Every structure is written in structure tokens, then in C-alpha cells.
């Protein structure tokens, strides 16, 4: 139990990670272990890609699952997966995409017909997982890409933030179909995921400009359109994405630049956050220590001993909540919709 | 600390030789600024207090500029003297000669050609100094810049394989990257006294060397040495010099590079338009110009009038008093003071120095036109061209593919007047 | 009208060695930042007044204006220089006008009314007034830090960006009695190293310091009581030339209804009207945001690193200066009592 | 960039992909698992009928406590193993 | 220590008062004592009258003041005055108008340059106290009144909050010159000064409507103009008046109603506060116990024993900082000016 929430505003955020397989429970599937290691040690691993790998992992878990004598398949498979989840959660907090897919899988297990034999039950679950990835993630993503690349006019200067697989695929596809444009890649500390983006975009021959988020004001005067890949859309219409995304949207608003949020409908949640502190994810403050424009290359930082230093704390939040009034349009597989249509789309399932 | 530096001008003078006939190489403008000034600013940054410039080709005009320069004033950080010796000096020849004069006092900086850099050699010196303080058989530490192997600024000369002791930063192996050389052959004895070595093919060999006072005497001895890398470094490693050690300082910040080739001249110059070597940037106006930076890296001096319907595109530098015609395009191009561009032209990836006049309907690109060159109307020029010292081209002529013009008495083709090459103003 | 005219280079070097050395160091970015440039310029001016010989006030004025024009052009976005010049130029003018008649309202009424030994060895007096500037440039951090007991209170949360000796002295002074919290957004890429160092010094004073990335500025903004920023310069329209990323703090503050307080000495106040921001914003090396060893990336992409950021005058709520606390609307009267409004263009 | 080390000795700890035993019955003038190790080769023509990503091999270096006695380190390893009191 | 700055956001506000004369210092003048009682007891008078009574009392102080001949008038009169002030500020914190009149008197104590027989010395002093009261307060007030009155048009529905001398004078004068208008009086808890206003204005035969501050939104739809008296005008252009004044100005702004601040120049201050909490005056928490319709009628309240109840705290601030953007015009004796031009006037003295 962790209950003590003290003066610090960040105190409630869970900071405990598991980077190794030391003292691991014996009931954890090998496929889950590998996923868990990739989760807490990867650096660019899209929210979509996280969900896809999770579902494909659960497929292996279910396939190899043999129901015990102490229960039917319905009641205990949820227990076995609950163990796999708890371990995965310990490595790194679940994404909204992962959390939603989990609620989906748990549901279909409970609505499994008991008259089905265990092999028919497993076969069916794998069918629906296959259909979930196919429809809700892949096809939905394709629709978003085409619908969003539609809004790109010749002469546009598209701003993007960090590394968004959705936005990346939109920009690339735009280049392919013959759209004439250029891109502003905005990057940020503690980790320069925007360089991963810049590499991908330049490899496809897309004309790019690379700046830090501090130079936002300067570079915003060249931007015609802003494209954002989301982690989740809140039910009040707010966009839940990485880092400075709200800052991009805020300064984008002041320069009359349309803020376009691209998010698959399966990443819509019923949660509504008012501030960016209540639901977030802490990143290790040690990332902020070494500063000279690189992640692991080493030369001693001024804040290296910050844990030992009294009253000196470092932290980097992974996400923030961009208010709905700063988002112009939400692009999903349902088409271009006002972001306040999120809870409406949810009921349509 | 009294520091000195030796600048081997006139070294790569033969490479730019349709040019370097009127001016010298070190007086050639990179971005409307003579190459020698970049070198001087870098040395001044390094804390050099004494400069010696070896030169021959137009050594008079060189010495004149230096005499009338920023660096002959009471405020000048160093004292610059010039050395005139018989042309086509090798690095060894200059150093051997340097020894006969007992000019060299303490540790010194040795650069060949012209260096464009903003690397503070202050810490490289103290590293070199304290390294000698403990052991005096360490005679040279080479400043090199980290990079990627295929890096654009990493050329034929800069492409070399280094093997450095990861803790002592001592170079225990060097080999230039030649084609047909498919291997790296190390003598296994190195491994029993150096044991975490790092083989590096990612470095840029700036050839900015910090040498000790022994080196000139060490060149009097071993009188067969000509190139600082090819012979001297090879000698220390394969033990022609028996007990000498050399080190590397791999810089991880800023900029270093040398203007040696025509292509390096192009490479460095646009690395300068990009703010890579700050504050040594056109709009800093060190020689009291009036440049201003604008978006998409276009640099404009004052008193520059642009026609409307004129399109100056990215990476373009325009000197003062320069005029461009109606419906003309200038993209990624250096242009000097008092140029005049005719209407309906297209200039792309080219170089225009002072007093260059261009007629109408011209297609210029990938080219160097030296001062006072005048081009007629409807004349087309193409990549690799180089038009030197006021060579005049007349109406309706085509020029191309690396051909080097001159108005002089030597090997390269061409001469002045109405239609040139053909309808030749010289006949050959 | 510079000093390249009315004097040769070698004459300048001999007569005014300080001017030559300041020009060189302003161009080479050796002397750098508001304070260093202010002090050095003021000392160089002490030499100019000591060396220069004139019989007429006007010769003195235009001589200084010429030296000013040249020093300004050397590094035009270091407004601190020209301000010191304009300060002395006014100091000269009214030392003259009271010497003018010891030998015995509105600009709207000037439309209707009357149409149409003075200069030398007031030098001794001029030099004194220059020293008066030097003294005032020292009291800036002390005259400002004291005001922290009217704005900084216990258990408040304060947001700051980059590094400002003024802001730091401001915070720590209140911190030796009252206990509060400070969130420091680093000024990546430029004010990065300096801000981390300041953050450590704050924490050592027991101010409960938090160092965040620049992207975190919005996320934590909702819990911040007050924004206290430093600046590089304050322009003619009351605008702010400040260090990179400071508009992120400004915009996010206005969006969260958080007050923006600026701590700056009056000497950073320049009459230069920002007809532009492009000429204002200087760009450092791309090396700071991208390593040069990224060969593929740097040859295929425009890489820009602004050194400064601009903040519109209406985004600042309070100016904490050495003179005291004033609203942005009062900067108008601060100038007309400091500079002479003809030296605005030097 | 390559880091060289004759300061390192093999701890004979290995872990392979399954297909490496399909790299141990068919191809075999192979020797010793240290003879094996080298001809992974990841580069050049390397013709030899591989069956499938690109092959890869990683090394890991410790700080303390791991090596092997094949030689007479047995004398030293035995001596090295007295972390005991009672 | 004499300090207590804790988690309570009201912990710093001076709550110490002197309700009786018990153990009163001996050197306090009788006229000062009675003023101390009335300041700490009356519900009836504010900054304007507080300043007048303060000055007239200090004349009596100086008039009855006898010079010791170990020193003389200039060095020691300022000390005796300081004693009277220290007692008065302990009965109730000094108003801005009082503090500014104090700086005036203290300055004029010093500038008399070791001149006169004391009696002459007293003689002038009372003069610019007489003149300060004349020019800065009374004359200026009359100027403000006629300046404000001519802004009143036939058919106006004017809102006044609480009980303000200046605004009351404006309204009364307005009907005297024969202007057709009606007044909306907005009142508030704990004590109801709006009644004293309503009583006064209806006795002068002015058409009046009476509502509580809770009904502000409702009654505002009838209002065409809002007139405010000020305790002080801050140097950033903000209005510092009674606790509910900002709410009046805020809702007034939302209904496109002009907010007119009427303040004498001598009540301008160099002080700038960014919120209503740093500089304010605590009112007795027991005032909030009375059940509402009346005050001091003795009704017990559920909250009566709040002093003894943990986590229960009653609170009533007296003052309120109204942001400059909500004030349309500031009417002083210098005329109608933008409120932001306050620090300019302080230079013209």
C-alpha cells in the first residue's frame, strides 16, 4: 500500500519500476517476460505498437493456457491473465490503448459460451483478438492516414512533435501520393525522439526543419498546419498525448494554426482529467542529469547527485492534457469529428 | 602562456589555379570573406600570440593585406609575421627552415592551407602541456573532429583510420583511407601495453596539429619527411623516430575543417551559411559588413535592391550594392559586393564574387565566377565551371562541365571578349 | 553616423584603445550579456570623455553618438551598450543646461508658440556621472532582492526559466526567512548548464527546487502561484527580449491565469522600437540542438537554434526594478526620465 | 567504432537461438564453441546456405566473480572462493 | 519570533486587535484614545472620514503638545506622534488614506528648518493639515462629484455597492441638479452597510432597489452604470476597495456596464499587489455567526462554537483587489483618467 500523499504535487505518481527478471513469479509466461523487458527498456515504442504486441502476446499466453481441475476456462483464464498484467504493470504503467484492449479481452472471456470445449474457447478468443488488431488498430489507422493526408494542401508547412507513428505515416503517404510540402519537426528533452522522426522523414526524402520546443515561437511563424498523434482522447474532448503537445497547441492557436489530432477510436477513454498531474507517468529524473544533447554518452552533470541533495528534485512528466478548445479537429476512422464527439463515438462501440 | 602558430599558406594553391592567378588562395572569399581571416580568428580564439605565415604565390599581395589588416593594429591579439620562401613548400621544408631560425620557442600550432573553426584550443593546449609536463617524448597532439564515416565534411584526406588508447588518448595507429587498401594491419606488440584501444573510422582529420619545440629539429633530422601525416606520423609509429609518442584530441563540439579542395570550399562555405561555425557567421560582420540573417538561411547586406517578381530562395548570400533583375531566381548561392544580375535568370548552387555582371536569360549553376567577370545575355553556364579574373563572355554562348577559364598565360583554356570559347578571344 | 568616419582606424586605436578592444570583443562575443556589456561600455565611455578634446558641447555629443553608433553596430542585439551611451548622452546634455544658466510641460503646446566654454572641462563632472552609473549598476541586485518580501510568501509555488542572477538573488533573499517552492524549467539548449547550477544553489538555500524539462512547463502550470522571469532586454514598446523558450512560460501562464513578474534593472530598458523580431532574434549554432556527427541528418534538414525569445508587452503583469515595482504602462514615463528620445536612434 | 580488449577471457557462458543446433549437426569442421563462435560472420559474401532478420551476436562483460578454471587457475579460483568466516 | 506563516493561506494576516484600553500606555493623548475606540468599534465610517478624524485629532495632539527643553520641537514631535500612531494601529490597521496623511505630516515635521518659536511652529502645521484636509480631501471630493455627475444621463440605473461617501455624494448631488435616475444598492454580509446607504438615499427622495450580492447577476440586467468608491487605487491600475467590489466589476463587465471608480488622489499608493490575499484586513470571524437578516440581534448560530471546533474556521476579509481591466474609468480631482495612469499622478504630487 502507498497512501501517503504529502505536499509534493508529484507524490501520488507511481515511481516504482522493474527493469530485470530478478525474483520474478514462476507463473509468468515467457512471452510476457520478453514484452515486459521491451516495455521498460525500449525508448521509441508506439502506443499502437504497445497494444499490438500486448494482444499478440496474450494470444500466445491463451494458446498455451491449460485450464486446471479447480476451475472452468472462463473463471480462471481471467485470473491467469491478471497475473500477466500485474507483472507487466510493474515494469511500466499501462497505456490507455493497452488498458482498453485488456478490458476488451477480459469481456470476451466472460461472454464465452460454457458449452464450448476449452480448445473451441481458445480458438474463438484468438479470432476476436485477430479481429481487434485488424479492425480497431490497423484498418482504423489506414483510414486515419488517408483522411488526414487529405487535408494537406500544396505549399503546406506541417509541424509535428516527437515521434508519432500516425503522423509519420500520414506525412510519408502524403509525400508518396504527390503532395508538395515541407515539415517542421519539433523535438524536446530529456529524450530527442524527434530525431528518430527526423531520420525517418529525411530517409523518405521529405524536406524538414528541426528545432527544440523552446524555439516554438520562432518556428511557429512558418507553420501552416499542425498534426498530432495522440495517446488518448478524453471524454471531454481533451487530448492526452506526450509532453509539450499542449504547448504546441497553445502557441499554434495564437498563430491561427489549425491543430489536428489524429487518434484511433479504440484509444478513446471515458476518463476526464481537469489537470495534467492527476493521471500521468513519471520518467526517471536521472535522464535530466546529463544534458549535453545526448542520452547515454557520458560526461558528469551538475545535478548528478540530486537524490543526495536536500531540496533538489528532478522529474520529467511523460504526458500532459491539452484542453479541447485548443484542438480543432480529431481525425479517427469515423472521419473528421469535433473532439467533443468522443463520448458519442464510444457508445457506437 | 606565450603561444605561437605556423600557418602554411600557398600550400594548396595549385588546386584553385584558374583562380589564385590574380589573388592568392588565402585571399579567396568563402562567403564574401577572405579565407585567411577565418584562420586568424580561429588562432586568436586559441590564444595564439605569435603568427608566422609561409607564402610564395603573390606573397606581396598577401603581405600587403596582412599589413592593412585587422591584425596589424595595436588591439590585435597576436603579432603576425610573414615568411617568403621558394614556392611549392612541403610541410617538412617549412619546418626544417623554421628550425634554422630558432623562431620556435615553445609548443606551437601547425596548420596547412586555411582553417575554418570555432574550437577553443585552450583546453587542448593545457592537455598537451600537462602531458608533456610528465613525459617530454610526446611531441604532437592532433586535433580531430568526431563525425560519421560517410560524413559530407569528411573527405579523401579527412578519411583516416585511427586507433587510440581509450584512457591515455594516445594514437597508436594511423592509416589514410585509400581504395584497394582493404585492411587494417596492426603490429600485435601494441596490445601488451595498450589494452583498451578504440579503432575509429568516424573521425574527421582536421590536421590541426599542436606540436612541441622538438618537432622542427626532428625535421632537420629525418630530412626525408615531406607530409605531416604521410611521413612524419608514419615515422613515429613505425619507429623511424624511436621514442616518440603522439596523441589525439577528438573534439566533440563545434566545427573544424580546412579549405583544401574546390569541393571542400563548397562544403565548408555552406556549413558556414548554416550557423555551424558561430560566431564566425556572415551576419556577425567581423570585417564591418552589414549582413543580416533571415529565415531559410538567406544573408543580405545593406544597399541591396531587389526587383519585385524576383525570387531569392534559401541558402543565399548577397553582397552589398548588388542588383537582381525582374523574374530572376537565386537559390543556394553566394554573391559578392557590387554584382548585377540581369532579368529572367536562374542561379543555383553557384558562386559569384565581387563586381560580377550577368546579362538576361542566363542559366548559371554550380559555378565560380571570380571578380570582375562579366557575362552576356542568353548565355548558359554549367556545373564545375570556373571563370577567373575578369574573363568576359558575350551574348548567346554556352559554358560547361568543369572548364576553367583564365585571361592569363597558362594551361587552362580560354580568354576574354565577345563570344568566348568558341569565337575565341584567344584561339587557345 | 559612426566613428569609421570622422576618424581613421589607426587614430581610433591610438586615441581610444578601449573602443577598439570593445568593438573586437563585442563582435567576438567575448564581452557578453547585459551586465558585462553595460559595465565595459561605461568604462570605455570614461576613456572617451577623458581622451576626447572639444570646445563645444555639440562636438562632444556627436563624438559620443559616433562612438555609440559604432559600438552598437558591433553587436546590435546587446541593447545594454547603447542604453549606457544614451544615458551618458543625456547626462552630458543637462549638466550643460544647468551650467548654461548658472551663468545667468506638454509637447502638445509646442505646435503653438515661440520659434528659436559650454563644452570643455565639464569633463571632470561628466566622469563623475559615469562613475555614478557604475555604482548604480552594482546596487541593482540589492535594490531588487529586497522587494521579495512583498511578493514571495511561504508555501507558494514559483516558476522560473533559465538563469538570472537577479531572479536568483530575488528568490534566495526571501528564502532565508520564508519557506517556499521553486520550479526551474531549464533553458535548453542555451541556458541549460546555467539553470541547473542555479537550481542547485537554490536548493542549497533550502527552497525546495524542482528541475523540469521545457515540455513540462504547461503540465505543472496549474499548480503555480506566480511566474518570476529575468530578461535580456526590455524594448521600446515595453516588449521583452529574453532567453529561449520564455514564451512557453509566458503563454502557458496567461492560459492558466498565472501572474507574470519580471525582475530586471532599468539599464536593460532600451528605446529601440521592435519594428521587427527577425532582426531581434539572434541564432546560435545548431551544434547545441544537434550533434555535428549526425552526417545524414544535418545535410538533409534545416537546423535552427534561436538564442533569444520575444514576449509581447501585454504578457507581463509586474516589473520588479531597482527603482521599484511598476506596471508595463509606466515604462513610458521611465524612459522619458532616463533617455532624451533623440538618442533612441544612436 | 570498435573497442579492443585482450583484457577479457571467455567465461564459457553462452546462450543461443534454437537454430544454432541447426548450426551444429550439418556444418562441421566446427570446433569447441570457441571455434564455433567466430564463424557467425555477419559480413561480406559469407556464402553458406543460411536459413531465415540479420544475424547478430553480443558480448557482455562483468565486473567481478566470473571466470573458469581450465588451466591452473584452480589454485587461484579455489583461493578466490573464501568469502567465509566460521 | 512574532511570525506565523503556515499552510493556512490566511495565516499571515494580522489578527491581533486591541478592543479595550486596559493597560493602555500612559503617553497616549485622550483624543487619540477615543479615536482608537471608534476605529475599533464603529461600523459607520471608512477611509475618507478616518483620515479627516485622524488629522484633526493630531492637531489636538500637537496643540496640547508641550516642548521639553532638553531638545526642541523638530526632533521630538515626530517621536510623540509615533507613539500615538503605534497605539492606533494596534486598535485597527491603518488605512491607505491614513498612512499617506501620516507620511505627509511626518515629512512636514522635518522640513521646518529649525526656525520659529514653537507656537508659530504649531501654527503652520495645523495650516496644511487644515490645507491637506481642505485641498486633498474635501475640495477634491467636490471636484470628483461634479466630474462624475455629468456622466449621469436621464434614465440611468446606477449601481452602488455598500456605503460609500463619495458615491453617495455623487448620487445625492445628481438628483439635486434634477437628473432622472434610480439607484440599485447592493449589500453584503456580515454587517449590512448597504442599509445605511439605502436609508440615506431614500431620505433624499431617490428611487432605489435593494438586493444582496448573491442577486448580482439578476439585478445587473437592469443596471446601466456602476459607481465605486475606493479605499485606495493601486499603482498597477487596480482598485482596492471593499470585499465584494471585484465581483461587482466582474459581472458588470460581463453585462457591458461601465465600471466607474471614484477615488481622491491622496488615496493613490505605490503599492502593487497581484491578489486580494497578500494585503488585506481580517474582520472578526464571530460576525459570520449571526443568522442573516439582521446583525447584533443576538441569534445563536450553528457555527457559534467554531473556535472550539477543529477543521472549522470562519473568515471574512474586508477588502478586495479589482484588476485594472475591469475598471472602465478612474474619476479623481485630476479628472477622468484611465486607471493605469495612477503612478503618473504620484509624480505630479
Curated annotation (Swiss-Prot), chains A, E:
GO terms for molecular function: guanyl-nucleotide exchange factor activity; translation initiation factor activity. Belongs to the eIF-2B alpha/beta/delta subunits family. Component of the translation initiation factor 2B (eIF2B) complex which is a heterodecamer of two sets of five different subunits: alpha, beta, gamma, delta and epsilon. Subunits alpha, beta and delta comprise a regulatory subcomplex and subunits epsilon and gamma comprise a catalytic subcomplex. Within the complex, the hexameric regulatory complex resides at the center, with the two heterodimeric catalytic subcomplexes bound on opposite sides. The chain holds residues 114 to 462 of 467 of the full protein. This is Translation initiation factor eIF2B subunit delta. Keywords: Cytoplasm, Initiation factor, Phosphoprotein, Protein biosynthesis. The lineage of its organism: Eukaryota, Fungi, Dikarya, Ascomycota, Taphrinomycotina. GO terms for cellular component: cytosol; eukaryotic translation initiation factor 2B complex. Signal peptide: none annotated. GO terms for biological process: cytoplasmic translational initiation. The keyword Hydrolase does not apply. It is found in: Cytoplasm, Cytosol.
Curated annotation (Swiss-Prot), chain B:
The modification Phosphothreonine is found at residue 157. GO terms for biological process: cytoplasmic translational initiation. The keyword Transcription regulation does not apply. The keyword S-adenosyl-L-methionine does not apply. Signal peptide: none annotated. Belongs to the eIF-2B gamma/epsilon subunits family. Acts as a component of the translation initiation factor 2B (eIF2B) complex, which catalyzes the exchange of GDP for GTP on the eukaryotic initiation factor 2 (eIF2) complex gamma subunit. Its guanine nucleotide exchange factor activity is repressed when bound to eIF2 complex phosphorylated on the alpha subunit, thereby limiting the amount of methionyl-initiator methionine tRNA available to the ribosome and consequently global translation is repressed. This is Translation initiation factor eIF2B subunit epsilon. It comes from Schizosaccharomyces pombe (strain 972 / ATCC 24843). The lineage of its organism: Eukaryota, Fungi, Dikarya, Ascomycota, Taphrinomycotina. The chain holds residues 16 to 443 of 678 of the full protein.
Curated annotation (Swiss-Prot), chain C:
It is found in: Cytoplasm, Cytosol. InterPro entries: eIF2B_beta_subunit, IF-2B-related, IF_2B-like_C, M1Pi_N, NagB/RpiA_transferase-like. The keyword Cell membrane does not apply. GO terms for biological process: cytoplasmic translational initiation; regulation of translation; translational initiation. Disulfide bonds: none annotated. It holds the Pfam family IF-2B. GO terms for molecular function: guanyl-nucleotide exchange factor activity; translation initiation factor activity. One of its GO terms (cellular component) is cytosol. Keywords: Cytoplasm, Initiation factor, Phosphoprotein, Protein biosynthesis, Translation regulation. The keyword Phosphoprotein applies. Component of the translation initiation factor 2B (eIF2B) complex which is a heterodecamer of two sets of five different subunits: alpha, beta, gamma, delta and epsilon. Subunits alpha, beta and delta comprise a regulatory subcomplex and subunits epsilon and gamma comprise a catalytic subcomplex. Within the complex, the hexameric regulatory complex resides at the center, with the two heterodimeric catalytic subcomplexes bound on opposite sides. Belongs to the eIF-2B alpha/beta/delta subunits family. This is Translation initiation factor eIF2B subunit beta. It comes from Schizosaccharomyces pombe (strain 972 / ATCC 24843).
From Swiss-Prot, chain D:
It is found in: Cytoplasm, Cytosol. Acts as a component of the translation initiation factor 2B (eIF2B) complex, which catalyzes the exchange of GDP for GTP on the eukaryotic initiation factor 2 (eIF2) complex gamma subunit. Its guanine nucleotide exchange factor activity is repressed when bound to eIF2 complex phosphorylated on the alpha subunit, thereby limiting the amount of methionyl-initiator methionine tRNA available to the ribosome and consequently global translation is repressed. Component of the translation initiation factor 2B (eIF2B) complex which is a heterodecamer of two sets of five different subunits: alpha, beta, gamma, delta and epsilon. Subunits alpha, beta and delta comprise a regulatory subcomplex and subunits epsilon and gamma comprise a catalytic subcomplex. Within the complex, the hexameric regulatory complex resides at the center, with the two heterodimeric catalytic subcomplexes bound on opposite sides. Belongs to the eIF-2B gamma/epsilon subunits family. This is Translation initiation factor eIF2B subunit gamma. The lineage of its organism: Eukaryota, Fungi, Dikarya, Ascomycota, Taphrinomycotina. The chain holds residues 230 to 344 of 458 of the full protein.
Amino acid at each position: 500500500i502507498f497512501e501517503e500523499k504529502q505536499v509534493s504535487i508529484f507524490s501520488h505518481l507511481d515511481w516504482r519500476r522493474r527493469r530485470t527478471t530478478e525474483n520474478i513469479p514462476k507463473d509468468i509466461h515467457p512471452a510476457v517476460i520478453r514484452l515486459g523487458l521491451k516495455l521498460a527498456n525500449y525508448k521509441i515504442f508506439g502506443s499502437n505498437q504497445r497494444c499490438i504486441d500486448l494482444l499478440k502476446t496474450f494470444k500466445i499466453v491463451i494458446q498455451d493456457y491449460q485450464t486446471p481441475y479447480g476451475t472452468t476456462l472462463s473463471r480462471h483464464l481471467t485470473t491467469h491473465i491478471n497475473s500477466q498484467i500485474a507483472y507487466l504493470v510493474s515494469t511500466r504503467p499501462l497505456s490507455i490503448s493497452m488498458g482498453n484492449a485488456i478490458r476488451f479481452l477480459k469481456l470476451e472471456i466472460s461472454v464465452l459460451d460454457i458449452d464450448l470445449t476449452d480448445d473451441e474457447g481458445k480458438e474463438l478468443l484468438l479470432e476476436k483478438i485477430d479481429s481487434y488488431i485488424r479492425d480497431r488498430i490497423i484498418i482504423a489507422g489506414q483510414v486515419i492516414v488517408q483522411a488526414a493526408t487529405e487535408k494537406i494542401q500544396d505549399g503546406d508547412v506541417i509541424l509535428t512533435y516527437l515521434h508519432s507513428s500516425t503522423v509519420n505515416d500520414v506525412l510519408i503517404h502524403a509525400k508518396n501520393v504527390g503532395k508538395k510540402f515541407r515539415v517542421v519537426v519539433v523535438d524536446s528533452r530529456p529524450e530527442f525522439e524527434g530525431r528518430v522522426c527526423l531520420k525517418l522523414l529525411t530517409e523518405h526524402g521529405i524536406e524538414c526543419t528541426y528545432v527544440m520546443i523552446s524555439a516554438l515561437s520562432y518556428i511557429m511563424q512558418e507553420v501552416t498546419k499542425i498534426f498530432l498523434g495522440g495517446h488518448a482522447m478524453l471524454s471531454n474532448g481533451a487530448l492526452y498525448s506526450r509532453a509539450g503537445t499542449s504547448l504546441i497547441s497553445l502557441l499554434g492557436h495564437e498563430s491561427n494554426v489549425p491543430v489536428i489530432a489524429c487518434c484511433e477510436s479504440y484509444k478513446f477513454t471515458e476518463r476526464i482529467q481537469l489537470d495534467s498531474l492527476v493521471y500521468n507517468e513519471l520518467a526517471p529524473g536521472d535522464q535530466l542529469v546529463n544534458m549535453g544533447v545526448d542520452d547515454f554518452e557520458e560526461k558528469p552533470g551538475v545535478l548528478a547527485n540530486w537524490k543526495s541533495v536536500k531540496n533538489l528534485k528532478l522529474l520529467s512528466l511523460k504526458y500532459d492534457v491539452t484542453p479541447p478548445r485548443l484542438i480543432t479537429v480529431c481525425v479517427c476512422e469515423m472521419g473528421l469529428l469535433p473532439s467533443t464527439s468522443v463520448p458519442a463515438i464510444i457508445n457506437e462501440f | 602562456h606565450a603561444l605561437q602558430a605556423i600557418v602554411l599558406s600557398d600550400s594548396y594553391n595549385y588546386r584553385f589555379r584558374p583562380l589564385t592567378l590574380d589573388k592568392p588562395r588565402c585571399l579567396l572569399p568563402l562567403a564574401n570573406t577572405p579565407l585567411i581571416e577565418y584562420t586568424f580568428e580561429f588562432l586568436a580564439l586559441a590564444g595564439v600570440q605569435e603568427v608566422y605565415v609561409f607564402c610564395c604565390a603573390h606573397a606581396g599581395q598577401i603581405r600587403e593585406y596582412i599589413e592593412k589588416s585587422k591584425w596589424n593594429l595595436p588591439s590585435s591579439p597576436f603579432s603576425v609575421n610573414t615568411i617568403v620562401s621558394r614556392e611549392s613548400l612541403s610541410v617538412g621544408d617549412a619546418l626544417r627552415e623554421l628550425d634554422s631560425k630558432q623562431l620556435i620557442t615553445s609548443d606551437f600550432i601547425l596548420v596547412s592551407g586555411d582553417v575554418v573553426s570555432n574550437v577553443p584550443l585552450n583546453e587542448v593546449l593545457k592537455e598537451h602541456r600537462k602531458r608533456r609536463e610528465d613525459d617530454k617524448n610526446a611531441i604532437m597532439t592532433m586535433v580531430v573532429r568526431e563525425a560519421s564515416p560517410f560524413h559530407r565534411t569528411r573527405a579523401r584526406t579527412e578519411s583516416s583510420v585511427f586507433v587510440i588508447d581509450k584512457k591515455t588518448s594516445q594514437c597508436v595507429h594511423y592509416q589514410a583511407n585509400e581504395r584497394g587498401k582493404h585492411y587494417v594491419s596492426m603490429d600485435p606488440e601494441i596490445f601488451n601495453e595498450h589494452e583498451e584501444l578504440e579503432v575509429r573510422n568516424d573521425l574527421i582529420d582536421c590536421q590541426i596539429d599542436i606540436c612541441s619545440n622538438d618537432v622542427p629539429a626532428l625535421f632537420t633530422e629525418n630530412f626525408d619527411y615531406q607530409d605531416i601525416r604521410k611521413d612524419f606520423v608514419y615515422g613515429v609509429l613505425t619507429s623511424d623516430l624511436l621514442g616518440k609518442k603522439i596523441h589525439c584530441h577528438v573534439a566533440k563540439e563545434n566545427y573544424a575543417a580546412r579549405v583544401r579542395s574546390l569541393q571542400t570550399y563548397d562544403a565548408i562555405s555552406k556549413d558556414v551559411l548554416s550557423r555551424w561555425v558561430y560566431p564566425f557567421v556572415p551576419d556577425s560582420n567581423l570585417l564591418n559588413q552589414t549582413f543580416s540573417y533571415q529565415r531559410h538561411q538567406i544573408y543580405k547586406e545593406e544597399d541591396v535592391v531587389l526587383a519585385r517578381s524576383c525570387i531569392i530562395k534559401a541558402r543565399t548570400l548577397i553582397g552589398a550594392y548588388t542588383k537582381v533583375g525582374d523574374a530572376s531566381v537565386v537559390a543556394n548561392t553566394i554573391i559578392g559586393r557590387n554584382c548585377t544580375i540581369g532579368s529572367n535568370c536562374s542561379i543555383d548552387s553557384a558562386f559569384l564574387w565581387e563586381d560580377v555582371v550577368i546579362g538576361d536569360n542566363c542559366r548559371i549553376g554550380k559555378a565560380i565566377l571570380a571578380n570582375s567577370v562579366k557575362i552576356g545575355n542568353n548565355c548558359s553556364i554549367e556545373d564545375g565551371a570556373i571563370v577567373a579574373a575578369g574573363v568576359v563572355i558575350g551574348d548567346n554562348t554556352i559554358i560547361e562541365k568543369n572548364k576553367r577559364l583564365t585571361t592569363f598565360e597558362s594551361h587552362s583554356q580560354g580568354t576574354l571578349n565577345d563570344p568566348s570559347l568558341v569565337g575565341i578571344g584567344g584561339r587557345g | 553616423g559612426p566613428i569609421s568616419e570622422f576618424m581613421s582606424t589607426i587614430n581610433v586605436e591610438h586615441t581610444y584603445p578601449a573602443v577598439s578592444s570593445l568593438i573586437a570583443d563585442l563582435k567576438s562575443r567575448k564581452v557578453q550579456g547585459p551586465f558585462a556589456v553595460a559595465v565595459e561600455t561605461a568604462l570605455v565611455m570614461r576613456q572617451v570623455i577623458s581622451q576626447t578634446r572639444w570646445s563645444t558641447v555639440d562636438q562632444l555629443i556627436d563624438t559620443v553618438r559616433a562612438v555609440g553608433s559604432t559600438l552598437v553596430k558591433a553587436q546590435p542585439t546587446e541593447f545594454s551598450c547603447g542604453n549606457i551611451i544614451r544615458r551618458i548622452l543625456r547626462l552630458i546634455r543637462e549638466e550643460y543646461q544647468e551650467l548654461l544658466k548658472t551663468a545667468d510641460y506638454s509637447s502638445m503646446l509646442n505646435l503653438l508658440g515661440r520659434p528659436t566654454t559650454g563644452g570643455m572641462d565639464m569633463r571632470a563632472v561628466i566622469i563623475s556621472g559615469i562613475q555614478d552609473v557604475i555604482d548604480e549598476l552594482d546596487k541593482i541586485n540589492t535594490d531588487i532582492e529586497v522587494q521579495s518580501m512583498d511578493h514571495l510568501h511561504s508555501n507558494e509555488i514559483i516558476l522560473t526559466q533559465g538563469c538570472s542572477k537577479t531572479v536568483e538573488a530575488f528568490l534566495r533573499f526571501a528564502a532565508k526567512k520564508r519557506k517556499f517552492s521553486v520550479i526551474v524549467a531549464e533553458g535548453f539548449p542555451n541556458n541549460q548548464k546555467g539553470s541547473h547550477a542555479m537550481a542547485k544553489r537554490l536548493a542549497q538555500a533550502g527552497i525546495d527546487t524542482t528541475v523540469i524539462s521545457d515540455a513540462t512547463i504547461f503540465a505543472i502550470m496549474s499548480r503555480v502561484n506566480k511566474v518570476i522571469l529575468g530578461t535580456h532586454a526590455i524594448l521600446g514598446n515595453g516588449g521583452l527580449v529574453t532567453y529561449s523558450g520564455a514564451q512557453l512560460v509566458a503563454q502557458a501562464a496567461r492560459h492558466h491565469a498565472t501572474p507574470v513578474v519580471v525582475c530586471s534593472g532599468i539599464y536593460k530598458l532600451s528605446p529601440v522600437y521592435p519594428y521587427d523580431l527577425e532582426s531581434i532574434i539572434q541564432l546560435s549554432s545548431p551544434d547545441k540542438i544537434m550533434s555535428f556527427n549526425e552526417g545524414d541528418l544535418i545535410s538533409r534538414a534545416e537546423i535552427l537554434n534561436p538564442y533569444y525569445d520575444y514576449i509581447p508587452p501585454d504578457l507581463v503583469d509586474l516589473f520588479i526594478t531597482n527603482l521599484g515595482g511598476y506596471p508595463p504602462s509606466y515604462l513610458y514615463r521611465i524612459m522619458n526620465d532616463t533617455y532624451d528620445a533623440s538618442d533612441t536612434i544612436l | 567504432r570498435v573497442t579492443l580488449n585482450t583484457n577479457l577471457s571467455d567465461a564459457h557462458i553462452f546462450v543461443f537461438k534454437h537454430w544454432v543446433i541447426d548450426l551444429i549437426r550439418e556444418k562441421e569442421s566446427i570446433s569447441s564453441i570457441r571455434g564455433d563462435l567466430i564463424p557467425y560472420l555477419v559480413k561480406c559474401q559469407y556464402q553458406k546456405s543460411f536459413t531465415v532478420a540479420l544475424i547478430a551476436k553480443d558480448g557482455i562483460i562483468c565486473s567481478r566473480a566470473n571466470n573458469l578454471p581450465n588451466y591452473f587457475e584452480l589454485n587461484k579460483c579455489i583461493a578466490k572462493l573464501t568469502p567465509e568466516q566460521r
